[PDB]
A paper describes a structure:
We therefore expected that this part of the molecule was amenable to larger structural variations and prepared the two subseries 12a–12h and 16a–16e. A benzyl residue as in 12c led to an increase in potency (IC50 = 80 nM) that could be further enhanced by a two-carbon spacer as in 12d (IC50 = 40 nM). In summary, the modifications of residues addressing the P1′ and P4 pockets led to up to 9.5-fold increase of potency compared to the starting point 13b, as demonstrated by an IC50 of 40 nM for the α-ketoamide 12d with a small N-Me group for P1′ and a 3-phenylpropanoyl unit for P4. While the larger P4 residues as in 12d enhance inhibitory activity, they are not beneficial for intracellular exposure.
The main protease Mpro is a clinically validated target to treat infections by the coronavirus SARS-CoV-2.
Author numbering:
A (entry chain AAA): 1 to 302
B (entry chain BBB): 1 to 301
C-alpha cells in the first residue's frame, strides 16, 4: 500500500528528446519519425520576445539556421513549417526510437507526466494537473522549453503538452502538440493574466478514496448529500461543481471501498465547513486535488 | 521556477527490469550484464513466508525452477547464488542495455527515485527519502518486490535500494543490491517495529531555501541563532541535531539566496516555536523533510 505522486516511466520519451539551436536560443524538441517539434519562439532573439511577428521572423530563417543534435549526432533539417505556436523541422533521419504515439488535447483536472529536459537531455520527471484555468504548477528553468507532458497506455505514448512560458504568478503555460495554447495565452513577453483557479472537486474525492484504501477513516460520516446540496456548499469554497458524469467516473472507487460517491461527498462537505481540526489525511494538512480517479485506481489497485 | 518532487528519468533502469518466477511466486528482478538480482523470498510459498529456512528452501531449487523473462524473451538461468537477502541468478546473456552502474548504500536522510514494477514491467516512478529509522514511505502493491531505487550521476546509475516488504504501520523496507537490509529487519512474515522516526533537519532548511528561491519570503526574520541555541529547540520538536557538516552541505544554497545558514536556522526555530498556524510554504501547510540540499540545487540551477 502507501500513496505518492507517481509519474509514467520516462523511457520511451527520453528516446525522442533532442536539442534545437537557432542563433542565441537553444531549447528542447520532440523527434518522432522524420519531424522535430519545438516552440516557434526558438527563432526569437530576446529583442523579438517583447512583440514578435513570428511570420516575418520565420521568413528570415532557412533550414541551416536550425542546429538539431540527437545526443552526439546532428540531424540535417531539410523542411520547416509553422503550425500555430510550434515549429515542425523535417529532418533527413527518422527516430528509430519513435514509440507508438498519439497527440491528444487533455481537459482541465486531468494529469500527465513531464519529462523536464535541458539541451535535449532528460533531467527529471514529475506529475502535473491541467488547472481549471489551463495553467500548470510545474518546475521549469530557462532551457526547459519544448519539454513535453505525456501519458502511456501500455504501448502508446499520448503527447498532450509542450512547455512554452512562465506567467507572473510562477505558474506555467504550454500548447498541445499542434501548437495551440491551453488557455488565453500568447507566445510573447508581456504580463498575462491566468484568472481565478478553482479546486478540482472530482480529484479531491478520488484522493479521499485513496486515503480510505490506505486506512485513514476519521473524516467518514454516516451522512449523504444530493449533488445540488454539495454543489451550492462547494461553489462557496471555490470548488469545481460536481456533475452526474464526475459521479460515474468515481464509481469504480465507490465499489473498491463500499462507500457511495454521495456519502463521500457528504464527508467532503463536512471538511470544507469544519476544516480538518489540525488532523491529517495521507499525512497532509490540506486537501489534494491533482490525483485523478484513474491515478488513484492505477496506484491503489494496479 | 516552481518546485516539485522530481524523479530521475527511468529509461536506463527500465532497460534492466525483468520478471522472475519461482514455482507460484513471481516478482521483479534487475538484469545487469549476465546476472539478475532479486529478493530471495521468491523461493517461498506463503507457509514458508511465516518462518523460512532460506538455506534448506534454496537447496530444493535447481536452475530450471527459475523462469526469467525480458519482455517476451526467456533467459536461461545457468547458476544461482544467495547473497544475504538477494538471489543472484546467472544467465547465458549479458543485458545489452546494461548502463554504467554502481551499488551504493545511501545514508538516512538521502533521497533516490523508485521505479515501481509488476511482472517485470515498469509502471511508475516516484521520489523517496530513506527515513532516519531506515524505512521508506513508498507506494507498493503485491508484485512490486524487486522494484529498485537509484540516483543518476550524468550517465552512471547508482543502485541503492531493492523492495522486499511492508511493515505493520504501512511503510516499506528493503535492501541494498548486496541484499543487506536497511535497518533492523528480516524477510519473515512477522510484525516488526521501525521505532521512533525523526525529522531530517538539513532537508527542512534546504526546502525553506527552495521556498525563498521561489518567492515564499514571509517566514524570513531579522534574527540569526547559534547551532547550540538551534539544536536545544530541535531536540524538543524531535528534529535531528544540526552539525558543521550540515551547515557546509547547505553552503551553496546560502550562496544562491544570500541568506546565511544561521539566519535561516532562526526562521525554523520561529516556525517550530509558533507552528505555521495553517500558513503555507510552497503551498504545503506542513514542513517538508524529503528534499536534500543536492535535490534543491539540481532543481533550482
Ligand atoms: C523557454 O523558452 C526555455 O526554457 N528556453 C528558452 C522559457 C522557459 C521559461 C523561462 C523560465 N521558466 C520557464 O518556464 N520560456 C520563456 O522564457 C518565455 C518565452 C515566451 C513565449 C515567448 N518567456 C519569455 C519572457 C518572459 C517570460 N516570463 C517571465 O518573464 C515571467 C512572467 C512575467 C512577469 C511580468 C512581466 C512579464 C512576464 C517567459 O516565460
Ligand atoms: C513482495 O513479496 C512481492 O511483491 N511479491 C509478489 C511483497 C511486496 C508487498 C505487497 C504489499 N506491499 C508490499 O510491500 N512483500 C511481501 O509480501 C512480504 C514478504 C516477506 C518479507 C518476506 N510480506 C509478506 C507477508 C506480509 C507482509 N506484510 C504485511 O502483511 C503487512 C504488515 C504486517 C502487519 C501485521 C502483522 C504482520 C505484518 C509482507 O510485506
Ligand atoms: Cl500539507
Ligand atoms: Na501538504
Amino acid at each position: 500500500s502507501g500513496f505518492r505522486k507517481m509519474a509514467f516511466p520516462s523511457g520511451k520519451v527520453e528516446g525522442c528528446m533532442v536539442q534545437v539551436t537557432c542563433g542565441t536560443t537553444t531549447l528542447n524538441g520532440l523527434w518522432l519519425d522524420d519531424v522535430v517539434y519545438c516552440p516557434r519562439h526558438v527563432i526569437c532573439t530576446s529583442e523579438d520576445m517583447l512583440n514578435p511577428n513570428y511570420e516575418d521572423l520565420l521568413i528570415r530563417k532557412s533550414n541551416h539556421n536550425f542546429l538539431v543534435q540527437a545526443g552526439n549526432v546532428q540531424l540535417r533539417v531539410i523542411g520547416h513549417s509553422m503550425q500555430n505556436c510550434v515549429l515542425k523541422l523535417k529532418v533527413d533521419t527518422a527516430n528509430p526510437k519513435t514509440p507508438k504515439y498519439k497527440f491528444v488535447r487533455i481537459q482541465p483536472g486531468q494529469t500527465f507526466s513531464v519529462l523536464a529536459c535541458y539541451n535535449g537531455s532528460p533531467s527529471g520527471v514529475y506529475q502535473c494537473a491541467m488547472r481549471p484555468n489551463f495553467t500548470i504548477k510545474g518546475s521549469f528553468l530557462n532551457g526547459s522549453c519544448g519539454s513535453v507532458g505525456f501519458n502511456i497506455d501500455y504501448d502508446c505514448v499520448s503527447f498532450c503538452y509542450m512547455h512554452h512560458m512562465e506567467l507572473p504568478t510562477g505558474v506555467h503555460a504550454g500548447t498541445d502538440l499542434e501548437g495551440n495554447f491551453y488557455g488565453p495565452f500568447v507566445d510573447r513577453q508581456t504580463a498575462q493574466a491566468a484568472g481565478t483557479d478553482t479546486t478540482i472537486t472530482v480529484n479531491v474525492l478520488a484522493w479521499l478514496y485513496a486515503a480510505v484504501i490506505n486506512g485513514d477513516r476519521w473524516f467518514l460520516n454516516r451522512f449523504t448529500t444530493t449533488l445540488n446540496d454539495f454543489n451550492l456548499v462547494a461553489m462557496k469554497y471555490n470548488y469545481e461543481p460536481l456533475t452526474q458524469d464526475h459521479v460515474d467516473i468515481l464509481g469504480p472507487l465507490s465499489a473498491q471501498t463500499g462507500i457511495a460517491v454521495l456519502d463521500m461527498c457528504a464527508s467532503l462537505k463536512e471538511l470544507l465547513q469544519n476544516g480538518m481540526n489540525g488532523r491529517t489525511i495521507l499525512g497532509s494538512a490540506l486537501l489534494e486535488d491533482e490525483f485523478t480517479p484513474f491515478d488513484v485506481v492505477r496506484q491503489c489497485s494496479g
